[PDB]
Amino acid sequence: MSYNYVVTAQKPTAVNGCVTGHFTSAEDLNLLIAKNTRLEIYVVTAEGLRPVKEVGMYGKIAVMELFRPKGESKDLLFILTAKYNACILEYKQSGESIDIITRAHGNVQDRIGRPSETGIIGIIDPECRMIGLRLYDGLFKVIPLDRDNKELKAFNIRLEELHVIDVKFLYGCQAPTICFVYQDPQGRHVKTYEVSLREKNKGPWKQENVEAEASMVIAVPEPFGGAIIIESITYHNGDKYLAIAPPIIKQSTIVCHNRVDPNGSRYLLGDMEGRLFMLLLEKVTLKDLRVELLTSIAECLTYLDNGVVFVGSRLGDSQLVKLNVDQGSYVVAMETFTNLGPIVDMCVVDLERQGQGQLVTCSGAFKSLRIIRNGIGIHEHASIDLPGIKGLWPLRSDPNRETDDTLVLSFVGQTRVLMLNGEEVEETELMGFVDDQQTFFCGNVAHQQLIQITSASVRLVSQEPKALVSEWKEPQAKNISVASCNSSQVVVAVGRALYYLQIHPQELRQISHTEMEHEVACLDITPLGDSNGLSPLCAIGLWTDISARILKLPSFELLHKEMLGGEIIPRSILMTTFESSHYLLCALGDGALFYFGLNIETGLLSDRKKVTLGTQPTVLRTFRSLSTTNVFACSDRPTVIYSSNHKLVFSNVNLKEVNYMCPLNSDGYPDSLALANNSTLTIGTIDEIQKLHIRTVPLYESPRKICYQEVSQCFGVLSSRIESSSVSSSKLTSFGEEVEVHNLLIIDQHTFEVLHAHQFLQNEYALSLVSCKLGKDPNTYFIVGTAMVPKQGRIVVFQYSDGKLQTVAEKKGAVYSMVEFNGKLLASINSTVRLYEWEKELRYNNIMALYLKTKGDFILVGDLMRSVLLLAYKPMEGNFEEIARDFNPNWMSAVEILDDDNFLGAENAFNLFVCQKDSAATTDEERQHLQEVGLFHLGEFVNVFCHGSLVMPTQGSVLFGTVNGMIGLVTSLSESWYNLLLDMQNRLNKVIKSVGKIEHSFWRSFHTERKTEPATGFIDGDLIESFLDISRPKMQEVVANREATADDLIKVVEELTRI
Amino acid sequence: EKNAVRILWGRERGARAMGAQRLLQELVEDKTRWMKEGKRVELPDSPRSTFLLAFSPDRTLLASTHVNHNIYITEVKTGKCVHSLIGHRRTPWCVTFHPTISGLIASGCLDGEVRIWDLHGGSESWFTDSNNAIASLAFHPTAQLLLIATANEIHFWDWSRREPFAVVKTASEMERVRLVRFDPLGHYLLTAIVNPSANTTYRLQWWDFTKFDLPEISNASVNVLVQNCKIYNDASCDISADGQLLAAFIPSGILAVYSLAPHNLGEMLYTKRFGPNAISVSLSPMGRYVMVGLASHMVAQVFRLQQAHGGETSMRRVFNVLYPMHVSINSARWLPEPGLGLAYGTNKGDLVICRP
């Protein structure tokens, strides 16, 4: 009765591995980015990085290295899933369809192994004689690489060094030789072994001692021989010894390393402080070592070629720097990815007070805000400071050679013609129209003529003669109110009468004349099917009666009409075909939009629904972004009417205000679209209706949370740096301690410029910020929590003012977390819940919390210690009561409430579980246990949960950000639809099993190292969204054995992709 | 910073500065040392006593032996008795879970009968030739094997065959084989043998079973790690999950920690002095806290390792674990995941799971 649906909107983008090789082909070097769950296959060129195949493999990549087996044409790839699902992958290059053929597969998981402290790493013998994987401590699993062993039958070999920091295979040796540094409790040492296959030894040199702050290993290639251990960079090969102690290196540590050239005369070392070191060696036995200093933070460096170095950052935007030989520095950035990494938190804000919402994230760290929306973005190209325009329509002043070279702008009572000779915007009038009269249409119809339908008289000016050929005017000296002419006929309405004119060769001929009951509001004639310019039907609106009717254009005879409520006249009405069924759009002056289906033959009144829009009048207009043309709405809340399968979407747009729109196809602007406003002129292309746009604003600090302000129109962001304004005055220490300097950056929502910074005390970690309305005081606050780690804790009530932050009250230990419940703050920390309230002050079970969340209800979800806790606030009692506590402890990371029953949750083992109060017995003896009504393994580190949605049959929604930068949605649904769809849930297994021959239920399992249970009611949205990607011949046999229609379920499922 | 946040901030920020997860679980063990309950479980029958708890490696279920000649299987979370293994005509003496194959458990009784049980269905049973008392059992994690020691004979039997394959015996009949156990890696084997002559002294011999060579345990001077050790049951010695830590009694009962790393193998790291009431020990999953059941309230104790020098002050007393009632603790063990709690058995016939 409560069954969920998980789907991801933005995939992870944090970088974890950048091993380079020849995976695509022997003659094409690749870069092999490895995100959390999906590996991106790029090919590096002179320009930069180019994706060729973005394979999302069903696994969490942990160990990944390219090796070349003997007798193999191309180097293979060894993906080690974080669940030990080791597979020797091989790129299958056949044709347009490309898949990942598994050479060998097998779960190499060990039921008794314990992962080594310093992560999981794997190495390959240089002569491909062996695969060595360091999964468990003191357990060097060895996989022979014979042509046999397709099941990957591994075996274990004991290691004397239980704790190993880094391990490699030394070059230039007969037997498999291994070099590595371990951490035996006497400084740090190095050892050598010869790995025996049959026996399952001694190395070239014995064990010595090295620096205790040296951890990284660089094994030099064959020409030199030996290994370099990394303020101490040594070198070791037999008995020869070398060591240097530069002073520059002592500032911080080094994390990245890789060989630069086969000779071994140069190396790369990446510092944690965004410093690019440069190791050098002088040429056999070398003489001495040397260090050099020449960027953003790097997690895995990879020297590509010709000075191009990929700076893969898991902490921030990964860069693509260049190292020039010639401020005299040699670190210049060329590319900067938009990779949202450490999404620490976010919130949903409606800046424009419209239906759609927005997300503001805090990405990056140390050395942070980004804006997340859902509408289609437009990149402005040319800006003109022009006044208000009454309309916009492209004009083809040239002959029938496609494109356009003229723009027509209509003022309140004037028509200014603009000429665009490329990127220039010059207002040049043509001698075929009137520039002092408002024109309702200035397009071209046929016969190389531009129809100028004005309020006074309809004019037709030939493009070649550049002069008016004919002029049709009503024989009553009345201004034209509504006009319509698409390609071959003119349907204009003057007052209560409408006249039909045909676009003849250099002549206008009236074809029909009729009068309506009420005054015509708008006229729209357009072919919605097999019609070449000659529109069969014709739409007309009424103002006195506010009704929409459909009539035949040739005779102006009404066919059907639909009644509407209210008294607002329809601002615009349009009918067009965008899918298998034509749709008719009706828009009112107040912004109400009615969408109904239309038939090109009859035009019966199909289903009609009320769609909200901006408060300003809406003028419907179609846009050509993709092969399937979409409609665009111009109002205070602009939106684009796109579609997915058969239903019209209403995705918003990236603009402040829109007054008019017009497609453009000029030479200087191929896919641009004219945009109008009160005083503005912008252009844009738009391709999809689901891309998310990101705007950046760096802060160079470590943020913790964020909250929006509704009355001051400015965000607030916590700062914590390590080294307008304000300083704390807390009037209520060794030289080397743990102290951070904190601020509070108030970012304007208009100029994106910080306006204040409240510097706090030293050695006080304030990581909380809440915006609410505490108590009866109408003033809106910026409540910030401050914690020192803990015998003290204070909270600053940052009552905002015109320009100065203020404090109202201060009020044993470090508080953990609390958000406003209804109008109060009664936190639950330090093993004691509270009953606080807002004198302008802030004035027991062992309840301490780490994460806290609640919906507007009295229902509250928390966590005491590694368990989802549900708390109810009883207003009669005014405290918290433990309703039902979830057992089976999990290391939680973020918690949310879906509805009154389903409780969404996540934990550090990358798994999601939902609790629910299923019916039970014994009054209250087992109801306190929340039986998990679901188990799902997501594969990401969900960090923050928030309600809201990016759009305007579940009741509610939820968003969650990850540590790798993934956003997604979770819903809930009854058992009736679930149980019927449960049988066909596994139907997709037959057509495709997996990418690496992995069991479907194995991903449906609970991949924690202790348990394993198939998914219970967690319906995936990733697999089902791939149902539409299945080829049509392959789609036929699936769901083929009440009517059992081929596309019956697609309509039933196409409503899911709109969630 | 000694906070969950900054360690976790580094974690969620994708900075793979490993060891933080180790430290976080170090913190929660430190945190859980301050928090406080006694939850019982029903049984299909009323056994007089509960012996030899043994936790699952997947934590799905929990077997336990009782004087009623039956083995009760209980789920940890629900605390509901699900299965009751029956078929032993005598009380089982050794029960061990299977690390790899789920649900395949063995149990041996004082009558010389071993029974390999499966929850899904089916069972096997073998009989000792002279129905002697069974001493200890030890499953082989990776290899298909379970070693059987009864008086002084080590039986090498594969359950795929009806009869044991190899038969290896000590130097003397009185040189009894008391305890056998593989390590959490399966690389080394610890064999407890009584010393030639209560003050019954035993020794530990450290055989490398990497090559599956039959251990010539007749020699009392080869691969010896402990000259004298007090052993009465199989729970008196245990190896940490990491396998680098070990606890074993020594005579003047003195509990001492010996590093299992080859660099200082046999070196005595930490020590404390205990009375004769000390019976069984158990190490926390990350090798920092030790649980010990005590015989007759203060029935259990927990300690913490601070510095390794071999002196008395190596650990410090933390707190006590009580039971909602003389009562002597028979068995106890840390739950597989750190910080969850602990389960134990009672000489009076009780199974109580305690959590903070």
Author numbering:
A (entry chain A): 1 to 200, 203 to 232, 235 to 287, 295 to 305, 308 to 339, 343 to 383, 386 to 741, 762 to 770, ...
B (entry chain B): 6 to 41, 43 to 203, 856 to 910, 919 to 962, 973 to 1001, 1008 to 1038
From the paper:
Based on HDX information, a truncated construct comprising residues 1–204 directly fused to residues 853–1044, referred to as AMBRA1WD40, was designed for cryo-EM structural studies and then co-expressed with the DDB1 E3 adaptor in HEK 293F cells. We next determined the structure of AMBRA1WD40 complexed with DDB1 by cryo-EM. The overall resolution for the structure is 3.08 Å, allowing visualization of the large side chains in the reconstruction. The structure of DDB1-AMBRA1WD40 showed that 4 individual beta-propeller domains cluster with each other, with the longest dimension of ~130 Å. AMBRA1WD40 is characterized by an N-terminal helix-loop-helix motif (E6-K41) and a seven-blade WD40 β-propeller domain that packs against the BPA domain of DDB1. WD40-N adopts Blades I-III and the first two strands of Blade IV, while WD40-C contributes to the latter two strands of Blade IV and the remaining Blades V-VII. In AMBRA1, this several-residue long loop is replaced by the 650-residue intrinsically disordered region that separates the WD40-N and WD40-C parts. The N-terminal helical motif is almost entirely engulfed by the large pocket formed between BPA and the BPC double propeller of DDB1, stabilizing by the hydrophobic interactions contributed by W953, F1003, V360, L814, and A381 of the BPC domain with V10, L13, and W14 in the first helix of AMRBA1. Additional DDB1-AMBRA1 interactions include the ionic bonding of AMBRA1 D64 with BPC R1080, AMBRA1 H929 with BPA D184, and AMBRA1 D866 with BPA R158 in the loop regions. 3D classification without alignment analysis demonstrated that this domain can adopt different orientations relative to the BPA-BPC double-β-propeller fold for substrate presentation.
AMBRA1 is a tumor suppressor protein that functions as a substrate receptor of the ubiquitin conjugation system with roles in autophagy and the cell cycle regulatory network. Damage-specific DNA binding protein 1 (DDB1) is a component of the Cullin4A/B-RING E3 ubiquitin ligase (CRL4) complex and functions as an adaptor protein between Cullin4A/B (CUL4A/B) and CUL4A-associated factors (DCAFs) to target substrates for ubiquitination. AMBRA1 limits CDK4/6 activity by mediating ubiquitination and degradation of Cyclin D1 as part of the CRL4DDB1 E3 ligase complex. DDB1 has three seven-bladed WD40 β-propellers (referred to as BPA, BPB and BPC) and a C-terminal helical domain (CTD).
